[PDB]
């Protein structure tokens, strides 16, 4: 009869466990969100600067200096 009772309980205890693991990982996730933003933004600046007419003119002139 009360076999499902015991079973529901085991189930809720496993749930607590899954909640534990997830909350543990949360802080690494917010730090990483800052990591990625720094990476995508800087590679993007690099790309734009490389396409710049004034930058191109600059490179092909630094040598002669």
């Amino acid at each position: 009869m009360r076999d499902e009772r015991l079973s529901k309980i085991i189930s809720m205890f496993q749930a607590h466990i899954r909640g534990y693991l997830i909350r543990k990982a949360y802080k690494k996730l917010q730090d990483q969100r800052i990591g990625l933003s720094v990476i995508q933004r800087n590679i993007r600046k690099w790309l734009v600067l490389r396409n710049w007419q004034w930058w191109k003119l600059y490179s092909k002139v630094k040598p002669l200096l």
Binding site: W52, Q53, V61
Partner: protein, 156 residues
């Protein structure tokens, strides 16, 4: 120092600006203190590939007024607005190298840039990995950071 509306505090270095005046004077072919449409034409035609659609008009357009060394310095600074240093960029990458190997698997870093965050498009992806240091299936973020930062070890 002045405005072309972006820069707040141009603390980009003194060796870095000393070079630029040597560059500017070589570009100012007519010796009068201003870069003309004709100064660019002459100098660029010499070094090789030389723009002449009136994008030469587009180049001079970029500056709100006459082009002296000071407007020059100002427009370049606007371009460097929004950029971090090598230490900051290198530790950003390290946040993903749990085993402190000082490298990342190539499959991993490609997935990070294209399917997450402000994700890259195919043309951004292509231009980013054309130049990148990879061996044994391992991306070297230390070497890549010094590269895009222009570190002068050897680019002679």
């Amino acid at each position: 120092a002045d405005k072309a509306a972006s820069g707040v505090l141009t603390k980009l270095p003194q060796k870095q600006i000393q070079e630029m005046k040597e560059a500017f004077s070589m570009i100012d072919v007519d010796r009068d203190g201003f870069v003309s449409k004709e100064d660019i034409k002459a100098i660029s035609e010499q070094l090789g590939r030389a723009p002449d659609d009136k994008e030469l008009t587009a180049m001079l357009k970029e500056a709100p007024g006459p082009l002296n060394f000071t407007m020059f310095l100002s427009i370049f600074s606007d371009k460097l607005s929004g950029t971090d240093s090598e230490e900051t960029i290198r530790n950003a990458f390290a946040m993903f190298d749990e085993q402190e190997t000082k490298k990342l698997n190539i499959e991993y870093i490609k997935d990070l840039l294209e399917n997450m965050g402000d994700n890259f498009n195919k043309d951004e992806m292509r231009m980013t990995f054309k130049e990148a240091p990879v061996e044994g299936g391992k991306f070297d973020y230390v070497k890549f950071t010094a590269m895009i930062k222009g570190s002068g070890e050897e680019e002679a």
